[PDB]
Protein backbone atom coordinates (compact mmCIF):
# COMPACT_ATOMS: atom_id res chain seq x y z
CA UNK A 1 0.00 0.00 0.00
CA UNK A 2 1.78 3.09 1.69
CA UNK A 3 -0.93 5.45 0.59
CA UNK A 4 -2.86 7.08 3.45
CA UNK A 5 -6.55 6.61 2.42
CA UNK A 6 -5.99 3.22 3.17
CA UNK A 7 -4.83 4.16 6.93
CA UNK A 8 -7.14 3.45 9.56
CA UNK A 9 -6.58 4.96 13.22
CA UNK A 10 -7.70 2.87 15.81
CA UNK A 11 -7.40 3.24 19.83
CA UNK A 12 -4.51 5.65 21.35
CA UNK A 13 -1.48 3.70 22.24
CA UNK A 14 1.31 6.66 23.49
CA UNK A 15 1.89 10.05 23.56
CA UNK A 16 4.91 12.40 24.15
CA UNK A 17 5.41 15.81 23.67
CA UNK A 18 5.48 16.05 19.96
CA UNK A 19 3.06 13.41 18.76
CA UNK A 20 0.21 11.15 19.82
CA UNK A 21 0.35 7.61 18.58
CA UNK A 22 -2.06 5.44 17.59
CA UNK A 23 -2.61 1.76 16.37
CA UNK A 24 -3.97 1.70 13.17
CA UNK A 25 -4.27 -0.35 9.81
CA UNK A 26 -2.58 0.42 6.48
CA UNK A 27 -4.52 -1.87 3.71
CA UNK A 28 -5.29 -4.69 6.28
CA UNK A 29 -1.82 -4.46 7.78
CA UNK A 30 -1.41 -3.52 11.58
CA UNK A 31 0.81 -0.52 12.02
CA UNK A 32 1.18 2.68 14.49
CA UNK A 33 0.65 5.98 13.45
CA UNK A 34 2.24 8.99 15.29
CA UNK A 35 0.43 12.34 14.55
CA UNK A 36 1.89 15.33 14.74
CA UNK A 37 0.48 19.05 14.75
CA UNK A 38 0.86 22.07 12.43
CA UNK A 39 3.01 23.38 15.70
CA UNK A 40 5.16 19.95 15.75
CA UNK A 41 5.85 20.73 11.69
CA UNK A 42 9.53 20.49 12.04
CA UNK A 43 9.94 17.65 14.30
CA UNK A 44 8.21 15.65 11.90
CA UNK A 45 10.33 16.87 9.03
CA UNK A 46 13.44 15.72 11.07
CA UNK A 47 12.09 12.68 11.80
CA UNK A 48 11.22 11.70 8.65
CA UNK A 49 14.26 12.63 7.14
CA UNK A 50 16.20 10.78 9.48
CA UNK A 51 14.59 7.82 9.04
CA UNK A 52 14.72 8.12 4.89
CA UNK A 53 18.39 8.65 4.97
CA UNK A 54 20.15 5.63 2.86
CA UNK A 55 20.77 2.00 5.33
CA UNK A 56 18.82 3.24 8.15
CA UNK A 57 17.30 -0.31 7.91
CA UNK A 58 18.60 -2.14 10.59
CA UNK A 59 16.49 -4.52 13.73
CA UNK A 60 17.32 -2.41 16.36
CA UNK A 61 16.05 0.71 14.81
CA UNK A 62 12.44 1.49 14.54
CA UNK A 63 10.52 0.12 11.29
CA UNK A 64 9.83 2.96 9.35
CA UNK A 65 6.86 2.73 6.58
CA UNK A 66 5.81 6.27 4.97
CA UNK A 67 4.92 10.18 6.33
CA UNK A 68 2.95 12.54 4.60
CA UNK A 69 1.18 15.73 5.50
CA UNK A 70 -2.77 14.48 6.13
CA UNK A 71 -5.12 17.97 6.11
CA UNK A 72 -8.18 16.80 8.99
CA UNK A 73 -11.83 16.98 7.67
CA UNK A 74 -11.66 20.12 9.48
CA UNK A 75 -9.01 21.55 7.02
CA UNK A 76 -6.31 21.16 9.80
CA UNK A 77 -3.07 20.88 9.03
CA UNK A 78 -1.77 17.29 10.45
CA UNK A 79 1.46 14.87 9.88
CA UNK A 80 1.23 11.41 9.94
CA UNK A 81 4.33 8.80 10.85
CA UNK A 82 3.50 5.59 9.49
CA UNK A 83 5.87 2.56 11.36
CA UNK A 84 5.85 -1.00 12.23
CA UNK A 85 3.45 -1.32 15.45
CA UNK A 86 5.12 -2.93 18.75
CA UNK A 87 2.73 -4.81 20.82
CA UNK A 88 5.16 -4.34 23.62
CA UNK A 89 5.60 -1.01 23.86
CA UNK A 90 8.30 1.59 24.95
CA UNK A 91 10.87 -0.39 27.20
CA UNK A 92 9.65 2.05 29.88
CA UNK A 93 6.13 0.20 29.51
CA UNK A 94 7.61 -2.97 29.47
CA UNK A 95 10.14 -2.53 32.03
CA UNK A 96 6.93 -1.13 34.78
CA UNK A 97 5.08 -4.84 33.39
CA UNK A 98 8.02 -7.02 33.68
CA UNK A 99 10.73 -8.49 35.31
CA UNK A 100 13.28 -10.38 33.33
CA UNK A 101 16.62 -13.20 34.05
CA UNK A 102 19.93 -12.15 33.25
CA UNK A 103 19.79 -13.02 29.93
CA UNK A 104 16.92 -11.24 29.04
CA UNK A 105 17.93 -8.22 30.46
CA UNK A 106 21.19 -8.45 28.84
CA UNK A 107 19.14 -8.52 25.63
CA UNK A 108 17.48 -5.87 26.35
CA UNK A 109 20.51 -3.91 27.20
CA UNK A 110 22.92 -5.31 24.03
CA UNK A 111 20.27 -4.73 21.81
CA UNK A 112 19.66 -0.97 22.77
CA UNK A 113 23.46 -0.52 22.55
CA UNK A 114 23.50 -2.22 19.15
CA UNK A 115 20.91 0.06 17.34
CA UNK A 116 23.13 2.91 19.24
CA UNK A 117 26.15 2.23 17.81
CA UNK A 118 24.97 1.24 14.33
CA UNK A 119 23.09 4.76 14.58
CA UNK A 120 25.99 6.47 15.78
CA UNK A 121 28.53 4.98 12.44
CA UNK A 122 29.39 6.22 9.50
CA UNK A 123 28.78 4.26 6.30
CA UNK A 124 30.52 5.94 3.48
CA UNK A 125 29.29 3.71 0.96
CA UNK A 126 29.16 5.86 -2.25
CA UNK A 127 25.54 5.68 -3.40
CA UNK A 128 24.33 4.40 0.16
CA UNK A 129 26.35 7.25 2.45
CA UNK A 130 25.34 6.75 6.11
CA UNK A 131 26.31 9.43 7.91
CA UNK A 132 27.03 9.70 11.75
CA UNK A 133 23.93 10.42 13.64
CA UNK A 134 23.09 11.54 17.23
CA UNK A 135 20.04 10.94 18.91
CA UNK A 136 19.84 13.31 21.37
CA UNK A 137 16.80 12.22 23.25
CA UNK A 138 17.61 9.23 24.19
CA UNK A 139 15.82 7.13 27.23
CA UNK A 140 13.19 4.72 27.83
CA UNK A 141 10.35 6.36 26.35
CA UNK A 142 11.75 6.52 22.79
CA UNK A 143 12.76 2.71 22.78
CA UNK A 144 10.64 0.10 21.89
CA UNK A 145 10.44 -3.70 22.96
CA UNK A 146 9.89 -6.17 19.92
CA UNK A 147 8.06 -9.82 20.37
CA UNK A 148 11.76 -11.28 20.35
CA UNK A 149 12.58 -9.53 23.56
CA UNK A 150 15.21 -7.00 21.44
CA UNK A 151 14.91 -3.20 21.42
CA UNK A 152 14.60 -0.78 19.02
CA UNK A 153 15.46 2.51 19.20
CA UNK A 154 12.52 5.41 18.25
CA UNK A 155 11.35 8.54 17.85
CA UNK A 156 14.32 10.53 15.83
CA UNK A 157 11.71 14.22 16.30
CA UNK A 158 15.22 15.54 17.78
CA UNK A 159 18.16 13.52 16.19
CA UNK A 160 21.00 15.20 14.46
CA UNK A 161 23.47 13.99 11.27
CA UNK A 162 27.03 14.15 12.46
CA UNK A 163 28.54 13.41 9.46
CA UNK A 164 28.54 14.62 5.55
CA UNK A 165 27.42 17.45 3.26
CA UNK A 166 24.95 19.85 5.32
CA UNK A 167 25.52 20.28 9.49
CA UNK A 168 24.01 21.73 12.30
CA UNK A 169 20.69 24.95 21.49
CA UNK A 170 21.54 21.57 23.30
CA UNK A 171 18.65 22.10 26.14
CA UNK A 172 16.17 20.07 24.54
CA UNK A 173 16.12 16.74 25.41
CA UNK A 174 14.00 15.25 27.94
CA UNK A 175 15.45 16.60 31.35
CA UNK A 176 16.61 13.76 33.61
CA UNK A 177 18.63 11.97 31.12
CA UNK A 178 20.58 14.98 30.67
CA UNK A 179 24.39 14.78 30.55
CA UNK A 180 26.59 17.01 33.01
CA UNK A 181 27.84 19.09 30.27
CA UNK A 182 24.48 19.35 28.88
CA UNK A 183 23.09 20.87 32.23
CA UNK A 184 26.21 22.86 32.21
CA UNK A 185 25.48 24.45 28.88
CA UNK A 186 29.14 22.89 28.11
CA UNK A 187 28.56 20.72 25.21
CA UNK A 188 32.19 21.21 23.11
CA UNK A 189 30.66 22.01 19.85
CA UNK A 190 34.74 21.85 18.67
CA UNK A 191 34.36 18.10 17.79
CA UNK A 192 30.61 18.23 17.53
CA UNK A 193 30.48 14.35 16.42
CA UNK A 194 32.14 13.12 19.44
CA UNK A 195 30.64 15.59 21.72
CA UNK A 196 27.21 14.19 20.95
CA UNK A 197 27.84 10.57 20.88
CA UNK A 198 28.87 11.42 24.48
CA UNK A 199 25.64 12.30 25.18
CA UNK A 200 23.85 9.33 23.87
CA UNK A 201 26.24 7.44 25.52
CA UNK A 202 25.39 8.96 29.12
CA UNK A 203 21.87 8.22 28.76
CA UNK A 204 22.63 5.16 27.83
CA UNK A 205 23.67 4.27 31.36
CA UNK A 206 20.69 5.85 32.80
CA UNK A 207 19.07 3.64 30.41
CA UNK A 208 21.23 0.42 31.50
CA UNK A 209 20.28 1.05 35.04
CA UNK A 210 16.84 1.13 34.61
CA UNK A 211 16.84 -2.44 32.69
CA UNK A 212 19.53 -4.12 35.38
CA UNK A 213 16.92 -2.58 38.43
CA UNK A 214 14.30 -4.98 36.70
CA UNK A 215 16.73 -8.35 37.17
CA UNK A 216 15.33 -11.14 38.95
CA UNK A 217 18.76 -12.55 39.36
CA UNK A 218 19.84 -9.41 40.56
CA UNK A 219 17.65 -9.33 43.59
CA UNK A 220 18.66 -13.20 44.30
CA UNK A 221 16.06 -14.70 47.00
CA UNK A 222 14.21 -11.13 47.31
CA UNK A 223 11.77 -9.24 45.82
CA UNK A 224 12.96 -7.10 42.28
CA UNK A 225 11.86 -3.70 43.50
CA UNK A 226 8.74 -2.19 41.35
CA UNK A 227 10.24 0.32 37.81
CA UNK A 228 11.37 3.58 38.47
CA UNK A 229 13.24 6.12 36.29
CA UNK A 230 16.36 6.92 36.31
CA UNK A 231 16.51 9.68 39.32
CA UNK A 232 12.84 9.03 40.25
CA UNK A 233 13.27 8.93 43.85
CA UNK A 234 16.29 11.47 43.92
CA UNK A 235 13.81 14.23 42.08
CA UNK A 236 10.35 12.83 41.31
CA UNK A 237 8.61 13.01 38.15
CA UNK A 238 9.29 16.13 35.83
CA UNK A 239 12.34 17.54 37.41
CA UNK A 240 13.22 21.41 36.39
CA UNK A 241 16.40 22.00 34.43
CA UNK A 242 17.75 23.51 37.26
CA UNK A 243 16.97 21.49 40.30
CA UNK A 244 18.99 18.42 37.61
CA UNK A 245 22.05 20.55 36.88
CA UNK A 246 22.43 20.75 40.73
CA UNK A 247 21.99 17.37 41.49
CA UNK A 248 23.63 15.54 38.34
CA UNK A 249 26.47 18.04 37.53
CA UNK A 250 27.09 19.78 40.50
CA UNK A 251 26.73 17.23 42.99
CA UNK A 252 27.80 14.28 40.58
CA UNK A 253 25.10 12.10 41.87
CA UNK A 254 23.92 9.11 39.73
CA UNK A 255 21.40 6.54 40.66
CA UNK A 256 22.61 4.24 42.62
CA UNK A 257 23.23 0.55 42.61
CA UNK A 258 21.33 -1.33 45.41
CA UNK A 259 23.26 -2.99 48.32
CA UNK A 260 21.57 -6.64 46.78
CA UNK A 261 24.43 -6.04 44.28
CA UNK A 262 27.24 -7.76 45.54
CA UNK A 263 29.61 -7.02 43.72
CA UNK A 264 31.94 -10.31 44.70
CA UNK A 265 31.24 -11.49 41.17
CA UNK A 266 32.55 -10.88 37.83
CA UNK A 267 29.20 -10.65 36.09
CA UNK A 268 28.39 -7.78 38.47
CA UNK A 269 31.53 -5.83 38.66
CA UNK A 270 31.54 -5.36 35.25
CA UNK A 271 28.29 -4.49 35.17
CA UNK A 272 28.46 -1.53 37.52
CA UNK A 273 32.42 -0.71 35.79
CA UNK A 274 30.28 -0.72 32.46
CA UNK A 275 27.83 1.84 33.56
CA UNK A 276 29.82 3.74 35.30
CA UNK A 277 32.10 4.25 32.08
CA UNK A 278 28.85 5.33 30.02
CA UNK A 279 27.41 7.61 32.68
CA UNK A 280 31.03 9.21 33.25
CA UNK A 281 31.48 12.92 34.23
CA UNK A 282 33.96 13.29 31.93
CA UNK A 283 32.30 13.02 28.74
CA UNK A 284 35.99 12.65 27.02
CA UNK A 285 36.27 8.84 29.27
CA UNK A 286 32.62 7.97 28.42
CA UNK A 287 32.80 4.24 26.37
CA UNK A 288 31.70 4.51 22.77
CA UNK A 289 28.66 2.80 21.49
CA UNK A 290 31.13 0.01 20.01
CA UNK A 291 33.01 -0.43 22.97
CA UNK A 292 29.40 -0.91 25.07
CA UNK A 293 28.14 -3.39 22.53
CA UNK A 294 31.17 -5.75 22.80
CA UNK A 295 30.72 -5.17 27.31
CA UNK A 296 26.81 -6.30 26.86
CA UNK A 297 27.37 -8.92 24.36
CA UNK A 298 30.01 -10.48 26.84
CA UNK A 299 27.87 -9.98 30.32
CA UNK A 300 25.24 -11.62 28.39
CA UNK A 301 26.90 -14.59 27.28
CA UNK A 302 29.13 -15.27 30.70
CA UNK A 303 28.51 -18.82 31.95
CA UNK A 304 27.75 -19.40 35.65
CA UNK A 305 27.83 -17.06 38.47
N1 LIG B 1 5.70 2.05 16.72
C1 LIG B 1 5.18 2.07 17.98
N2 LIG B 1 4.54 0.98 18.52
C2 LIG B 1 4.05 0.99 19.76
N3 LIG B 1 4.13 2.09 20.54
C3 LIG B 1 4.73 3.23 20.14
C4 LIG B 1 5.30 3.29 18.80
N4 LIG B 1 5.85 4.51 18.65
C5 LIG B 1 5.62 5.21 19.81
N5 LIG B 1 4.97 4.42 20.71
C6 LIG B 1 4.54 4.84 22.07
O1 LIG B 1 4.19 6.23 21.99
C7 LIG B 1 5.05 7.01 22.83
C8 LIG B 1 5.42 8.33 22.16
O2 LIG B 1 6.06 8.04 20.93
P1 LIG B 1 7.27 8.98 20.43
O3 LIG B 1 7.58 8.61 19.01
O4 LIG B 1 8.37 8.82 21.45
O5 LIG B 1 6.58 10.45 20.45
P2 LIG B 1 7.17 11.82 21.06
O6 LIG B 1 8.24 12.27 20.08
O7 LIG B 1 6.00 12.78 21.11
O8 LIG B 1 7.63 11.45 22.46
C9 LIG B 1 6.29 6.14 23.08
O9 LIG B 1 6.88 6.50 24.31
C10 LIG B 1 5.70 4.74 23.08
O10 LIG B 1 5.15 4.44 24.36
MG1 LIG C 1 9.44 10.31 22.46
Not at 279 to 304: G, S, V
Amino acid sequence: SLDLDNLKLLELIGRGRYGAVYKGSLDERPVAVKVFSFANRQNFINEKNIYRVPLMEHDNIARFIVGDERVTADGRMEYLLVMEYYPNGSLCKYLSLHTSDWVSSCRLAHSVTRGLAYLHTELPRGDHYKPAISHRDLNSRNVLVKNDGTCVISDFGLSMRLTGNRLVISEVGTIRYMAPEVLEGAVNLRDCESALKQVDMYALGLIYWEIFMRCTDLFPGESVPEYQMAFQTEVGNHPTFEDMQVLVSREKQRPKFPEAWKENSLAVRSLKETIEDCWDQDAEARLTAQCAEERMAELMMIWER
